[PDB]
Amino acid sequence: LLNDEDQVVVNKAAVMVHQLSKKEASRHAIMRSPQMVSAIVRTMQNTNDVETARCTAGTLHNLSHHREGLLAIFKSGGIPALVKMLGSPVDSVLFYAITTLHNLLLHQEGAKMAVRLAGGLQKMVALLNKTNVKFLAITTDCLQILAYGNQESKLIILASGGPQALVNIMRTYTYEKLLWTTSRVLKVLSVCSSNKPAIVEAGGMQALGLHLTDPSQRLVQNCLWTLRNLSDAATKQEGMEGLLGTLVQLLGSDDINVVTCAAGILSNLTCNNYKNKMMVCQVGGIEALVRTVLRAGDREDITEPAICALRHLTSRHQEAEMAQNAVRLHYGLPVVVKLLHPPSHWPLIKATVGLIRNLALCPANHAPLREQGAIPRLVQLLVRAHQDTQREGVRMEEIVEGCTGALHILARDVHNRIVIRGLNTIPLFVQLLYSPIENIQRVAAGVLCELAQDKEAAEAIEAEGATAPLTELLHSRNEGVATYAAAVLFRM
């Protein structure tokens, strides 16, 4: 338990200091001695002898194993010193430094802010181009600790080139612990509005996709969570084929969170992306999603993104018609209509109406949608939704527009038109002509247009006083509205 020093540019002292840090008895003695630790800290902070640096950081390391050795290093200003040592060309020194910092980050209170202020973030990001996986695993974990729940750190990681460096790790290594820890950093960054497009631009979605068949469930799950965040309104990407095929396979996983994430990513990636729609359909996405909805029952965390994905797949791509038939052929129509009924909540109902609208584009779906009872439920939804508007989340105006839109397509069929008219919808449709919303005006005039091809209905529409609002609508700046209004006026 003796003296505590060195002078005269000799380093042998440290080479006696480390060798007793191992001894845990003299350890507690050292780390109760704030003068000793400062010398150690100052030494390596300045010393140009590699083996001295090695000896010093090593001692600091051993002290970091205890609550007081952390405090001591913390109070001696070891943190900025340790960050400095993240520049060392001795791999052995880098390792002690990042490890000690890691221990401080895990346990020592106030270490996170201290590391950030010392410039630890920028230094750690720069170290991501190293090649030792155990070293990288420690480094990425420090970044995870520092970035979590700290937007300021996230922006600094972005500014330092974090996204590309993390993505490169995911594309390069197979060491599970490193892949997992790196994916966790990406997950934390993926909710940042600035980091997200950067990660996508770096090829992050394709890189995470590489690991979706890994035996490690924690790795797979973190990749899926991150993917779901990134895939939300991303730029169109190339090389998505493998990812898309794997996501479809994962739909049949026995793991609920895997299934949920898979459906959500598929929904995100298919929205207004006809290439992705095509590819998903080609690997049997329709059958897989229908099976997913059926298995899900009333679990709306699964049905909502799955239904959305199905809605994307049944519209506006080369194989949309096939997908429309495929939903029926894989026994999907009854469950889709069912989702219009309680206990379904509004987002699901909104999505479900949209799907039905698309399914109705296929003539072979007209009769079975009628038979399954789609029309009266759509009408009831519409009636109640309109009443609510006339009195946050899903706006009832969206339900009004959606249901009327679905009915517009369903009204292509003569028997559907009979059902629709028999439910006293004409007065409502005529009233919707007065809507402030152009899209509501359009589908309202559209369904009236379909109905007006039958002479008896045309008279009913006229009797409802539709001539006047339709005349006003001839001058709609919305061309679709004007065109439908003219068509009804003609048929009357």
Short mmCIF file of C-alpha atoms in Angstrom, two decimals:
data_model
loop_
_atom_site.label_atom_id
_atom_site.label_comp_id
_atom_site.label_asym_id
_atom_site.label_seq_id
_atom_site.Cartn_x
_atom_site.Cartn_y
_atom_site.Cartn_z
CA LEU A 1 0.00 0.00 0.00
CA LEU A 2 2.97 2.34 -0.60
CA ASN A 3 3.86 5.44 -2.61
CA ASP A 4 2.23 6.81 -5.72
CA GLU A 5 4.46 8.40 -8.34
CA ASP A 6 6.88 8.72 -11.20
CA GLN A 7 9.19 11.44 -12.53
CA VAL A 8 12.36 11.69 -14.65
CA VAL A 9 10.79 10.19 -17.81
CA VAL A 10 11.02 6.60 -16.57
CA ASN A 11 8.16 4.18 -17.10
CA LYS A 12 9.26 1.19 -15.02
CA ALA A 13 6.96 2.54 -12.28
CA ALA A 14 3.84 1.91 -14.38
CA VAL A 15 5.30 -1.55 -15.17
CA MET A 16 5.00 -2.11 -11.40
CA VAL A 17 1.61 -0.34 -11.12
CA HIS A 18 -0.24 -2.65 -13.59
CA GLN A 19 1.25 -5.80 -12.04
CA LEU A 20 -0.49 -5.02 -8.75
CA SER A 21 -3.81 -3.98 -10.32
CA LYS A 22 -4.17 -7.71 -10.97
CA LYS A 23 -3.83 -8.10 -7.21
CA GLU A 24 -7.33 -7.07 -6.14
CA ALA A 25 -6.13 -6.18 -2.62
CA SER A 26 -3.68 -3.51 -3.71
CA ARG A 27 -6.35 -2.62 -6.30
CA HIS A 28 -8.81 -1.19 -3.73
CA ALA A 29 -5.78 0.54 -2.21
CA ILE A 30 -4.86 2.15 -5.61
CA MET A 31 -8.44 3.18 -6.35
CA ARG A 32 -8.76 4.86 -2.98
CA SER A 33 -5.76 6.98 -3.93
CA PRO A 34 -6.87 9.84 -6.27
CA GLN A 35 -3.25 11.07 -6.60
CA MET A 36 -1.95 7.76 -8.00
CA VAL A 37 -4.67 7.47 -10.64
CA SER A 38 -4.02 11.01 -11.94
CA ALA A 39 -0.38 10.14 -12.58
CA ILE A 40 -1.43 6.99 -14.44
CA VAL A 41 -4.01 9.01 -16.39
CA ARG A 42 -1.57 11.86 -17.11
CA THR A 43 1.15 9.35 -18.05
CA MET A 44 -0.63 7.57 -20.93
CA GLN A 45 -2.32 10.85 -21.87
CA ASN A 46 1.17 12.12 -22.75
CA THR A 47 3.66 9.22 -22.97
CA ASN A 48 5.11 8.29 -26.38
CA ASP A 49 6.41 4.89 -25.21
CA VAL A 50 3.95 2.28 -26.52
CA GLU A 51 4.56 -0.30 -23.76
CA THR A 52 3.95 2.45 -21.18
CA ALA A 53 0.63 3.34 -22.80
CA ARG A 54 -0.20 -0.37 -22.86
CA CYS A 55 0.67 -0.64 -19.17
CA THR A 56 -1.32 2.44 -18.17
CA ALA A 57 -4.58 1.83 -20.03
CA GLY A 58 -4.43 -1.75 -18.78
CA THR A 59 -4.33 -0.52 -15.18
CA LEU A 60 -7.23 1.86 -15.83
CA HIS A 61 -9.05 -1.11 -17.35
CA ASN A 62 -8.69 -3.27 -14.23
CA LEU A 63 -9.93 -0.42 -12.05
CA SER A 64 -13.01 -0.08 -14.29
CA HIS A 65 -14.19 -3.46 -12.97
CA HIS A 66 -15.22 -1.78 -9.72
CA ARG A 67 -17.71 0.94 -8.79
CA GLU A 68 -14.88 2.96 -7.18
CA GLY A 69 -12.35 2.39 -9.96
CA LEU A 70 -14.90 3.88 -12.34
CA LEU A 71 -15.56 6.84 -10.01
CA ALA A 72 -11.80 7.31 -9.66
CA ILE A 73 -11.16 7.30 -13.41
CA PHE A 74 -14.22 9.53 -13.80
CA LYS A 75 -12.99 11.98 -11.14
CA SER A 76 -9.40 11.97 -12.45
CA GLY A 77 -10.65 13.13 -15.85
CA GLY A 78 -9.83 9.76 -17.37
CA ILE A 79 -12.67 9.95 -19.90
CA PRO A 80 -11.19 12.69 -22.13
CA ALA A 81 -7.86 10.90 -21.74
CA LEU A 82 -9.41 7.59 -22.82
CA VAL A 83 -11.05 9.29 -25.83
CA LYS A 84 -7.63 10.68 -26.80
CA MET A 85 -6.28 7.13 -26.69
CA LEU A 86 -8.87 6.10 -29.29
CA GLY A 87 -6.34 7.60 -31.70
CA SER A 88 -3.48 5.33 -30.59
CA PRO A 89 -1.80 3.17 -33.28
CA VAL A 90 -1.36 0.35 -30.75
CA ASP A 91 -4.29 -2.04 -31.21
CA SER A 92 -3.62 -3.22 -27.66
CA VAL A 93 -4.17 0.37 -26.43
CA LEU A 94 -7.29 0.91 -28.55
CA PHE A 95 -8.71 -2.23 -26.96
CA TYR A 96 -8.09 -1.21 -23.33
CA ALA A 97 -9.41 2.28 -24.06
CA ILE A 98 -12.68 1.28 -25.74
CA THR A 99 -13.22 -1.43 -23.12
CA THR A 100 -12.70 0.95 -20.18
CA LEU A 101 -14.96 3.51 -21.87
CA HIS A 102 -17.49 0.72 -22.38
CA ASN A 103 -17.44 -0.16 -18.66
CA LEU A 104 -17.83 3.53 -17.80
CA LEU A 105 -20.77 3.80 -20.20
CA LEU A 106 -22.47 0.71 -18.77
CA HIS A 107 -22.15 1.56 -15.07
CA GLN A 108 -20.53 4.91 -14.20
CA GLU A 109 -23.19 7.60 -13.82
CA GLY A 110 -22.43 10.71 -15.86
CA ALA A 111 -20.13 8.88 -18.27
CA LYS A 112 -22.43 9.21 -21.30
CA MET A 113 -22.45 13.01 -21.25
CA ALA A 114 -18.73 13.08 -20.45
CA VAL A 115 -17.91 10.86 -23.45
CA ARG A 116 -20.02 13.01 -25.80
CA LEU A 117 -18.35 16.24 -24.62
CA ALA A 118 -14.89 14.71 -25.01
CA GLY A 119 -15.68 13.98 -28.65
CA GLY A 120 -16.10 10.25 -28.06
CA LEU A 121 -18.84 9.83 -30.69
CA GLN A 122 -16.76 11.14 -33.62
CA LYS A 123 -13.81 8.98 -32.52
CA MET A 124 -15.89 5.80 -32.17
CA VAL A 125 -17.52 6.28 -35.59
CA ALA A 126 -14.05 6.70 -37.16
CA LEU A 127 -13.02 3.37 -35.58
CA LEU A 128 -15.77 1.49 -37.45
CA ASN A 129 -13.37 0.89 -40.34
CA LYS A 130 -11.25 -1.39 -38.16
CA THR A 131 -11.27 -5.14 -38.86
CA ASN A 132 -11.22 -6.90 -35.46
CA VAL A 133 -14.77 -8.12 -34.78
CA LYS A 134 -14.45 -8.23 -31.01
CA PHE A 135 -13.14 -4.66 -31.05
CA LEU A 136 -15.93 -3.57 -33.41
CA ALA A 137 -18.51 -5.27 -31.20
CA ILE A 138 -17.40 -3.18 -28.20
CA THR A 139 -17.21 0.00 -30.28
CA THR A 140 -20.68 -0.38 -31.80
CA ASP A 141 -22.12 -1.14 -28.35
CA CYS A 142 -20.71 2.12 -26.97
CA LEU A 143 -22.44 3.91 -29.85
CA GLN A 144 -25.71 2.11 -29.08
CA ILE A 145 -25.52 3.20 -25.43
CA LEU A 146 -24.71 6.80 -26.40
CA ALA A 147 -27.28 7.15 -29.19
CA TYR A 148 -30.30 5.59 -27.47
CA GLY A 149 -32.82 8.23 -26.45
CA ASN A 150 -30.39 10.99 -27.40
CA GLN A 151 -31.21 12.78 -30.66
CA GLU A 152 -28.14 15.02 -30.38
CA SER A 153 -25.81 12.00 -30.45
CA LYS A 154 -27.76 10.53 -33.37
CA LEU A 155 -27.14 13.63 -35.52
CA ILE A 156 -23.44 13.56 -34.64
CA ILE A 157 -23.17 9.91 -35.66
CA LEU A 158 -24.85 10.87 -38.96
CA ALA A 159 -22.49 13.82 -39.48
CA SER A 160 -19.50 11.54 -38.84
CA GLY A 161 -20.58 9.04 -41.50
CA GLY A 162 -22.11 6.50 -39.13
CA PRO A 163 -24.83 5.03 -41.40
CA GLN A 164 -22.49 3.95 -44.24
CA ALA A 165 -19.94 2.48 -41.81
CA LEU A 166 -22.59 0.49 -39.93
CA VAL A 167 -24.14 -0.77 -43.18
CA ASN A 168 -20.69 -1.87 -44.39
CA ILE A 169 -20.29 -3.91 -41.19
CA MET A 170 -23.63 -5.66 -41.85
CA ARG A 171 -22.50 -6.47 -45.41
CA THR A 172 -19.05 -7.72 -44.35
CA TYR A 173 -19.01 -9.73 -41.11
CA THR A 174 -20.70 -12.90 -39.84
CA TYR A 175 -19.80 -12.58 -36.15
CA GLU A 176 -23.27 -12.72 -34.57
CA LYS A 177 -22.56 -10.54 -31.55
CA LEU A 178 -21.19 -7.81 -33.84
CA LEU A 179 -24.06 -8.11 -36.33
CA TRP A 180 -26.55 -7.94 -33.49
CA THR A 181 -24.97 -4.95 -31.75
CA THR A 182 -24.56 -3.12 -35.07
CA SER A 183 -28.19 -3.79 -35.98
CA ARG A 184 -29.19 -2.26 -32.64
CA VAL A 185 -27.32 0.95 -33.49
CA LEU A 186 -29.07 0.99 -36.85
CA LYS A 187 -32.42 0.39 -35.10
CA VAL A 188 -31.81 3.40 -32.84
CA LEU A 189 -30.81 5.58 -35.81
CA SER A 190 -33.67 4.29 -37.97
CA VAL A 191 -36.28 6.38 -36.11
CA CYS A 192 -34.32 9.58 -36.79
CA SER A 193 -35.74 11.58 -39.71
CA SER A 194 -32.21 12.50 -40.78
CA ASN A 195 -30.43 9.18 -40.22
CA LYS A 196 -33.20 7.17 -41.91
CA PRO A 197 -32.74 8.35 -45.49
CA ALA A 198 -28.96 8.20 -45.00
CA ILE A 199 -29.14 4.55 -43.93
CA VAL A 200 -31.42 3.79 -46.89
CA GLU A 201 -29.01 5.58 -49.25
CA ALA A 202 -26.10 3.54 -47.87
CA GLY A 203 -27.92 0.38 -48.97
CA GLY A 204 -29.14 -0.40 -45.46
CA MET A 205 -32.34 -2.23 -46.36
CA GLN A 206 -30.52 -4.67 -48.66
CA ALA A 207 -27.80 -5.20 -46.05
CA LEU A 208 -30.23 -5.94 -43.21
CA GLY A 209 -32.08 -8.29 -45.56
CA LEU A 210 -28.98 -10.48 -45.76
CA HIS A 211 -29.51 -11.57 -42.16
CA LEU A 212 -33.25 -12.38 -42.11
CA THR A 213 -32.52 -16.13 -42.33
CA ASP A 214 -29.86 -16.11 -39.58
CA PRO A 215 -30.25 -18.70 -36.77
CA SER A 216 -30.04 -15.86 -34.20
CA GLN A 217 -33.59 -14.70 -33.39
CA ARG A 218 -32.36 -11.53 -31.71
CA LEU A 219 -30.44 -10.63 -34.88
CA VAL A 220 -33.37 -11.40 -37.17
CA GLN A 221 -35.80 -9.46 -34.98
CA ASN A 222 -33.63 -6.33 -34.79
CA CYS A 223 -33.15 -6.40 -38.56
CA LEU A 224 -36.93 -6.63 -39.04
CA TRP A 225 -37.68 -3.76 -36.63
CA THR A 226 -35.07 -1.56 -38.32
CA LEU A 227 -36.31 -2.57 -41.77
CA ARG A 228 -39.88 -1.59 -40.85
CA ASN A 229 -38.68 1.89 -39.81
CA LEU A 230 -36.51 2.39 -42.91
CA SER A 231 -39.03 1.03 -45.41
CA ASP A 232 -41.59 3.74 -44.58
CA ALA A 233 -41.62 6.09 -47.59
CA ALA A 234 -38.10 5.29 -48.78
CA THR A 235 -36.53 6.02 -52.17
CA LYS A 236 -36.94 3.32 -54.81
CA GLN A 237 -34.11 0.82 -54.39
CA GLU A 238 -32.52 -1.77 -56.65
CA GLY A 239 -31.50 -5.27 -55.55
CA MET A 240 -34.59 -5.72 -53.37
CA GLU A 241 -35.57 -9.09 -54.91
CA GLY A 242 -34.00 -11.31 -52.25
CA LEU A 243 -35.32 -9.17 -49.41
CA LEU A 244 -38.85 -9.24 -50.85
CA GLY A 245 -38.85 -13.03 -51.30
CA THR A 246 -37.57 -13.61 -47.77
CA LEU A 247 -40.20 -11.26 -46.29
CA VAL A 248 -42.94 -13.28 -47.99
CA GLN A 249 -41.50 -16.50 -46.49
CA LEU A 250 -41.35 -14.93 -43.02
CA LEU A 251 -45.12 -14.35 -43.20
CA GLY A 252 -45.52 -18.02 -42.29
CA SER A 253 -43.29 -17.77 -39.22
CA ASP A 254 -44.67 -19.07 -35.92
CA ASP A 255 -43.24 -15.93 -34.28
CA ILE A 256 -45.92 -13.23 -34.02
CA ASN A 257 -43.49 -10.29 -34.04
CA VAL A 258 -41.71 -11.72 -37.10
CA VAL A 259 -45.06 -12.02 -38.91
CA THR A 260 -46.12 -8.53 -37.84
CA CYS A 261 -42.85 -6.95 -38.98
CA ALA A 262 -42.84 -8.88 -42.25
CA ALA A 263 -46.34 -7.69 -43.16
CA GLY A 264 -45.49 -4.10 -42.22
CA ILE A 265 -42.33 -4.03 -44.32
CA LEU A 266 -44.16 -5.64 -47.25
CA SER A 267 -46.87 -2.99 -46.90
CA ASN A 268 -44.32 -0.15 -46.81
CA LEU A 269 -42.27 -1.51 -49.71
CA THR A 270 -45.26 -2.10 -52.01
CA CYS A 271 -46.96 1.27 -51.52
CA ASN A 272 -46.80 2.98 -54.94
CA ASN A 273 -43.88 0.78 -56.03
CA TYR A 274 -45.03 -1.25 -59.03
CA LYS A 275 -41.72 -3.10 -59.36
CA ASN A 276 -41.97 -4.34 -55.78
CA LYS A 277 -45.67 -5.15 -56.27
CA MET A 278 -44.78 -7.33 -59.27
CA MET A 279 -41.99 -9.15 -57.45
CA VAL A 280 -44.06 -9.78 -54.30
CA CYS A 281 -46.89 -11.21 -56.43
CA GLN A 282 -44.45 -13.42 -58.33
CA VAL A 283 -43.19 -15.15 -55.16
CA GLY A 284 -46.76 -15.92 -54.07
CA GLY A 285 -47.29 -12.81 -51.95
CA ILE A 286 -51.07 -12.80 -52.40
CA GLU A 287 -51.59 -16.34 -51.09
CA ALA A 288 -49.15 -15.69 -48.24
CA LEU A 289 -50.85 -12.46 -47.17
CA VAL A 290 -54.35 -13.99 -47.35
CA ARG A 291 -53.19 -16.91 -45.19
CA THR A 292 -51.65 -14.33 -42.82
CA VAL A 293 -54.94 -12.42 -42.51
CA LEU A 294 -56.87 -15.66 -41.90
CA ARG A 295 -54.47 -16.84 -39.19
CA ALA A 296 -54.39 -13.39 -37.58
CA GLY A 297 -58.10 -13.26 -36.71
CA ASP A 298 -58.83 -10.08 -34.78
CA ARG A 299 -55.17 -9.14 -34.25
CA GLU A 300 -55.15 -5.80 -36.06
CA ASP A 301 -51.40 -5.27 -35.70
CA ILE A 302 -51.18 -8.08 -38.26
CA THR A 303 -54.34 -7.63 -40.35
CA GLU A 304 -53.91 -3.87 -40.91
CA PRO A 305 -50.49 -3.99 -42.59
CA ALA A 306 -51.38 -7.25 -44.38
CA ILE A 307 -54.62 -5.81 -45.77
CA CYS A 308 -52.71 -2.66 -46.79
CA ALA A 309 -50.13 -4.82 -48.54
CA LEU A 310 -52.94 -6.68 -50.33
CA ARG A 311 -54.47 -3.34 -51.34
CA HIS A 312 -51.17 -2.26 -52.89
CA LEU A 313 -50.80 -5.59 -54.70
CA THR A 314 -54.28 -5.42 -56.25
CA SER A 315 -53.75 -2.09 -58.02
CA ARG A 316 -51.66 -0.42 -60.70
CA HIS A 317 -49.06 -2.91 -61.86
CA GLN A 318 -48.80 -5.42 -64.70
CA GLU A 319 -50.14 -8.35 -62.67
CA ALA A 320 -52.83 -6.48 -60.70
CA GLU A 321 -55.70 -8.34 -62.38
CA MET A 322 -54.09 -11.69 -61.51
CA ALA A 323 -53.66 -10.56 -57.90
CA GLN A 324 -57.33 -9.50 -57.80
CA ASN A 325 -58.37 -13.00 -58.86
CA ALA A 326 -55.74 -14.58 -56.61
CA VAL A 327 -57.33 -13.07 -53.48
CA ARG A 328 -60.59 -14.86 -54.35
CA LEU A 329 -58.90 -18.09 -55.45
CA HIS A 330 -57.09 -18.36 -52.11
CA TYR A 331 -60.37 -18.02 -50.20
CA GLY A 332 -59.79 -14.40 -49.19
CA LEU A 333 -63.11 -12.70 -49.96
CA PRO A 334 -65.16 -13.80 -46.94
CA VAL A 335 -62.55 -12.67 -44.37
CA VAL A 336 -62.02 -9.33 -46.16
CA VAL A 337 -65.73 -8.51 -45.87
CA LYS A 338 -65.69 -9.69 -42.23
CA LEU A 339 -63.01 -7.11 -41.38
CA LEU A 340 -65.55 -4.38 -42.19
CA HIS A 341 -67.44 -5.42 -39.04
CA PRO A 342 -66.63 -4.85 -35.34
CA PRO A 343 -64.43 -5.24 -33.46
CA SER A 344 -62.29 -3.81 -36.32
CA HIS A 345 -60.99 -0.31 -35.66
CA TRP A 346 -60.90 2.55 -38.17
CA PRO A 347 -57.42 2.14 -39.68
CA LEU A 348 -58.19 -1.51 -40.54
CA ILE A 349 -61.67 -0.65 -41.85
CA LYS A 350 -60.18 2.14 -43.99
CA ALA A 351 -57.59 -0.23 -45.43
CA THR A 352 -60.17 -2.99 -45.93
CA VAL A 353 -62.53 -0.71 -47.86
CA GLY A 354 -59.60 0.22 -50.11
CA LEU A 355 -58.82 -3.43 -50.79
CA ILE A 356 -62.44 -4.19 -51.68
CA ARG A 357 -62.45 -1.22 -54.06
CA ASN A 358 -59.51 -2.87 -55.87
CA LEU A 359 -60.95 -6.39 -55.76
CA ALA A 360 -64.12 -5.02 -57.37
CA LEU A 361 -62.09 -4.03 -60.44
CA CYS A 362 -62.18 -7.76 -61.27
CA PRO A 363 -65.59 -8.77 -62.74
CA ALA A 364 -65.22 -12.28 -61.30
CA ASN A 365 -65.23 -10.71 -57.81
CA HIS A 366 -68.50 -8.81 -58.33
CA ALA A 367 -70.83 -11.70 -57.49
CA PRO A 368 -68.92 -13.23 -54.57
CA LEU A 369 -68.40 -9.79 -52.95
CA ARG A 370 -72.19 -9.28 -53.27
CA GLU A 371 -72.88 -12.77 -51.89
CA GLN A 372 -70.54 -12.25 -48.93
CA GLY A 373 -72.51 -9.15 -47.95
CA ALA A 374 -70.06 -6.38 -48.85
CA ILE A 375 -72.66 -3.91 -50.13
CA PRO A 376 -74.94 -3.41 -47.13
CA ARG A 377 -72.00 -3.13 -44.70
CA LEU A 378 -70.28 -0.60 -47.00
CA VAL A 379 -73.52 1.37 -47.18
CA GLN A 380 -74.00 1.38 -43.39
CA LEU A 381 -70.39 2.50 -42.91
CA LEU A 382 -70.98 5.27 -45.47
CA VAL A 383 -74.26 6.46 -43.94
CA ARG A 384 -72.86 6.62 -40.42
CA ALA A 385 -69.57 8.22 -41.56
CA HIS A 386 -71.40 10.92 -43.51
CA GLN A 387 -73.65 11.69 -40.52
CA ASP A 388 -70.54 12.06 -38.35
CA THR A 389 -68.97 14.60 -40.76
CA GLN A 390 -72.20 16.63 -40.82
CA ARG A 391 -72.31 16.88 -37.02
CA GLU A 392 -57.51 12.73 -34.49
CA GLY A 393 -56.69 9.57 -36.48
CA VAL A 394 -58.87 8.41 -39.37
CA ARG A 395 -61.12 11.23 -40.57
CA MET A 396 -64.70 10.17 -41.28
CA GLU A 397 -64.43 12.03 -44.60
CA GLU A 398 -61.92 9.33 -45.58
CA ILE A 399 -64.46 6.60 -44.83
CA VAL A 400 -67.11 8.48 -46.83
CA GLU A 401 -64.79 8.75 -49.84
CA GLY A 402 -63.58 5.15 -49.54
CA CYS A 403 -66.99 3.49 -49.26
CA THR A 404 -68.47 5.56 -52.08
CA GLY A 405 -65.39 4.69 -54.15
CA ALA A 406 -65.83 0.98 -53.48
CA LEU A 407 -69.53 1.24 -54.36
CA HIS A 408 -68.69 3.12 -57.58
CA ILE A 409 -66.66 0.12 -58.78
CA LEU A 410 -69.15 -2.47 -57.51
CA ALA A 411 -71.90 -0.63 -59.40
CA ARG A 412 -70.37 -1.82 -62.68
CA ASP A 413 -72.41 -4.97 -62.08
CA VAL A 414 -76.15 -4.90 -62.84
CA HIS A 415 -77.13 -6.99 -59.80
CA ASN A 416 -74.97 -4.88 -57.49
CA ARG A 417 -76.73 -1.76 -58.83
CA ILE A 418 -80.08 -3.28 -57.87
CA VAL A 419 -78.80 -3.99 -54.34
CA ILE A 420 -77.18 -0.56 -54.00
CA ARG A 421 -80.35 1.25 -55.11
CA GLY A 422 -82.59 -0.95 -52.95
CA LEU A 423 -80.73 0.35 -49.89
CA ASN A 424 -81.95 3.91 -50.55
CA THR A 425 -78.51 5.30 -51.41
CA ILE A 426 -79.53 7.74 -54.18
CA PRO A 427 -80.50 10.58 -51.78
CA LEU A 428 -77.15 10.22 -49.98
CA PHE A 429 -75.13 10.09 -53.22
CA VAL A 430 -76.91 13.21 -54.47
CA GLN A 431 -76.18 14.95 -51.16
CA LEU A 432 -72.47 14.04 -51.48
CA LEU A 433 -72.42 16.14 -54.68
CA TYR A 434 -72.46 19.14 -52.33
CA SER A 435 -69.31 17.96 -50.52
CA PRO A 436 -66.44 20.47 -50.18
CA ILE A 437 -64.07 17.61 -50.94
CA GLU A 438 -63.41 17.03 -54.66
CA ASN A 439 -62.57 13.36 -54.29
CA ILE A 440 -65.92 12.77 -52.57
CA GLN A 441 -67.66 14.72 -55.36
CA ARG A 442 -65.91 12.50 -57.89
CA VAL A 443 -66.83 9.07 -56.54
CA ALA A 444 -70.34 10.33 -55.74
CA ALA A 445 -70.88 11.50 -59.31
CA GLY A 446 -69.19 8.31 -60.48
CA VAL A 447 -71.52 5.90 -58.68
CA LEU A 448 -74.49 8.01 -59.81
CA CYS A 449 -73.11 7.68 -63.34
CA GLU A 450 -73.05 3.88 -63.04
CA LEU A 451 -76.54 3.85 -61.54
CA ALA A 452 -77.93 6.19 -64.21
CA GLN A 453 -77.35 3.60 -66.97
CA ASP A 454 -80.59 2.01 -65.77
CA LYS A 455 -83.58 4.12 -66.80
CA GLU A 456 -85.52 3.60 -63.54
CA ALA A 457 -82.49 4.70 -61.50
CA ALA A 458 -81.92 7.71 -63.78
CA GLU A 459 -85.45 8.92 -63.03
CA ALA A 460 -84.89 8.40 -59.29
CA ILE A 461 -81.65 10.42 -59.48
CA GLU A 462 -83.49 13.20 -61.33
CA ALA A 463 -86.37 13.09 -58.85
CA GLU A 464 -83.80 13.55 -56.09
CA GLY A 465 -82.96 16.97 -57.54
CA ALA A 466 -79.53 15.97 -58.83
CA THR A 467 -79.71 18.15 -61.96
CA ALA A 468 -78.81 21.35 -60.11
CA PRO A 469 -75.67 20.25 -58.23
CA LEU A 470 -74.43 18.26 -61.26
CA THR A 471 -74.75 21.42 -63.37
CA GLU A 472 -72.57 23.32 -60.89
CA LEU A 473 -70.08 20.44 -61.06
CA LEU A 474 -69.69 20.81 -64.85
CA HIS A 475 -67.34 23.68 -64.03
CA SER A 476 -65.30 21.79 -61.44
CA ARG A 477 -61.58 22.48 -61.68
CA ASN A 478 -61.42 18.73 -61.07
CA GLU A 479 -61.73 17.16 -64.53
CA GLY A 480 -62.89 13.76 -63.28
CA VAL A 481 -65.71 15.40 -61.34
CA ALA A 482 -66.82 17.43 -64.37
CA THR A 483 -66.72 14.37 -66.64
CA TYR A 484 -68.87 12.22 -64.34
CA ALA A 485 -71.34 15.07 -63.77
CA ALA A 486 -71.74 15.47 -67.54
CA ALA A 487 -72.27 11.73 -67.99
CA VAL A 488 -75.10 11.61 -65.40
CA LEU A 489 -76.75 14.72 -66.83
CA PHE A 490 -76.68 13.05 -70.24
CA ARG A 491 -78.23 9.76 -69.09
CA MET A 492 -81.02 11.67 -67.31
#
